[PDB]
Amino acid sequence: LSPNPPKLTKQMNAIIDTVINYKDSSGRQLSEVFIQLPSRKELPEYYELIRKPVDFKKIKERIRNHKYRSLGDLEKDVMLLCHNAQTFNLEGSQIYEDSIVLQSVFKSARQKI
Ligand SMILES: COC(=O)c1c(N)[nH]c2ccccc12
Ligand SMILES: [Zn+2]
Numbered sequence: 001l002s003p004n005p006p007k008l009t010k011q012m013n014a015i016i017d018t019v020i021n022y023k024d025s026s027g028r029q030l031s032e033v034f035i036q037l038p039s040r041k042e043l044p045e046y047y048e049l050i051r052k053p054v055d056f057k058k059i060k061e062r063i064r065n066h067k068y069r070s071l072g073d074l075e076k077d078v079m080l081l082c083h084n085a086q087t088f089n090l091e092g093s094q095i096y097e098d099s100i101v102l103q104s105v106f107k108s109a110r111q112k113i
Contacts, residue, residue, distance in 0.1 A: 004066045011113050012063045012074050018109035019078070019102055020056060030098045030105075031056060034081060049088055054081050071110055078106045 020031045037055040038046050047053065059077055068074040085099035 004069070008071075009063065009066070011071065012068060013060075015071070015074065015106065015109045015113060016056070016059060016063065016078075019105050022102070022105045024101065030101055033095055033098065034085065034102070046088055050084050052080060053084065056081070071113075075106070075110065079103065 020035070021029070022031065023029050035056045037053050037057075040047055054077055059074070059081070062068055062077065063074065068077070082099040082103045085095050089096040089099075
């Protein structure tokens, strides 16, 4: 019904940048694996298991192409990314544990703004 106000777009980018730039206690950038999806050639099981594949690259593109109409819309996709990581990977694994932290980082970034 109307274009995204520049204020909303700036917020979406500010929230996602907080998530992407987040470095843990050891000083490790947790988002590293999630920026890009795995290769269809090396990990075909992933594409067999995961209904809606989404990475941080696609999220940035959807903010850019005004695909998210609200912060709740952006949240649904960030929650999807993490759910996907947790669906494919073993509980307790580095990827699995990282997605749980990034869910928390997003919520903390959103709740601030
Ligand atoms: C086995 O690796 C994964 O689970 C993921 C990967 N390589 N890139 C992603 C982007 C988003 C969610 C999960 C993943
Ligand atoms: Zn599910």
